[PDB]
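ugh ok so i messed up the first submission bc i forgot one of the chains. this is the corrected input, ALL of the components this time, i swear. 500 residues overall. if the numbers dont match what u have on ur side tell me asap before i send this to the collaborators (the ones from the other lab, u know who)
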Amino acid sequence: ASKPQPIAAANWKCNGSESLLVPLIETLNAATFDHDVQCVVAPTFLHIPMTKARLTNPKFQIAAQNAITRSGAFTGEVSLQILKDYGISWVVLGHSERRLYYGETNEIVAEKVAQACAAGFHVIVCVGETNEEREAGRTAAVVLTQLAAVAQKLSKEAWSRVVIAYEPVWAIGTGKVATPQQAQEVHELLRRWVRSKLGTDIAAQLRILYGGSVTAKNARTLYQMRDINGFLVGGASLKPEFVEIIEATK
Amino acid sequence: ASKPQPIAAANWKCNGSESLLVPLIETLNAATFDHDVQCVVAPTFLHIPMTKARLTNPKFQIAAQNAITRSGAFTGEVSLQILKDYGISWVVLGHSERRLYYGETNEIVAEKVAQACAAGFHVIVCVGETNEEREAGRTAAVVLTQLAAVAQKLSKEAWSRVVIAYEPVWAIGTGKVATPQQAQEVHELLRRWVRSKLGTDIAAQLRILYGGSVTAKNARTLYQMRDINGFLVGGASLKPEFVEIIEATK
Ligand SMILES: O=S(=O)(O)CCCSc1nc2ccccc2s1
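and heres the new structure output, hopefully the right one now
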């Protein structure tokens, strides 16, 4: 029925410096919103400590940009347990960049999401087709296969901590945002699939966010679509306009 | 010639928590090392901040366990520039776990090392052959090709900030503890290659660290080997025992 609580998530990706983030964080702290909205900021692992120490806005949660399922002999990686111990309860998993550059198959992503949910994390699970896949008319087949791989490892209860982020690969950092119709069409497909497998309530309460060239200028029109519950913001999240994007979820 | 300054590096891998690392750090801080030695601790990115704010032992430098060549749209990753801005001047690259689980090829490792050196970092370059490769009699071909790949991208002057770590992946991967003799067998060929391809000066100043199983029990015997200049320690580097391992390089 009515839309669940919206989410405005910032993916700073592999960017940042203390001198840059300090002022940015202060802007976030001074920002107020008159509607219920879950704001999220995902710094690089290296910047999580300074962010957690400085960010005070209660409507904000800190998320890691990735994580592996187990602590151990995995040089260079950061596990969910390590993040949990540090007080981080949100995490982005399966980002297109990780599926494409760092060998994250649908199954690997699913294992990550499964362990994250079991660990009590709110997970922003990313899905999305490439330009070639959309041109070949494989969009639905692709995103449903990505989502299905994850769902198969989750229990019914786990969905209360699951968030889906649809980011068409052709819309990431290209300045070519999906039209409201294009986004709505996929969000519908995703939610309808979830409903067929998990029921009315879970499908209705599920937040499905759009990501890919989202800006303060195109955010409002996108958010008004019936099946869009917020955004995963890349480039514009490291700018002051990110506050306007949040306001766009009112 | 005499051995150059030894290095005792701790690779904490994907392990750590405030409760574990604080006591260990203060234990390292309390220890006093009378000889010339470069100590290194490589915490996960998440723990680098607490380590930098707490580590005081004068013999220590803090290193990252990995890094990518550039900042940008690489969700989950940390770039060399972000680390440098944070004040981290040491980095481990090409560790077997990344070459095996995260598809880091010789070219990828070589490129990372080249940009690292260009960025002014001291780099611990990891090389090593698997059990299969060793059983096929390919130890030399494998490790030297890995080393050659990185060597081709560097200039002679860069080696002053390069460090090689030999990982007997064949031993680690089979749950075995390589003997000082098996360790030295590879260090001998590694230095022979460096001596003939890069120069007598480079070979004499180059630290070639043993990255196999090192504990307070076998550290001294390993360091006694002619071509071993220290270690890249695993599990034991997370224990107070690491103090004795460092002392074994005297
Ligand atoms: O060479 S293989 O690909 O068969 C094994 C590589 C070791 S990676 C892994 N190590 C552990 C250890 C405990 C639990 C789960 C895992 S996955």
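quick check: Chain A has one domain: 1-250. that seems consistent at least. The pocket of BTS is lined by residues A 70, 72 (CB under 6 Å).
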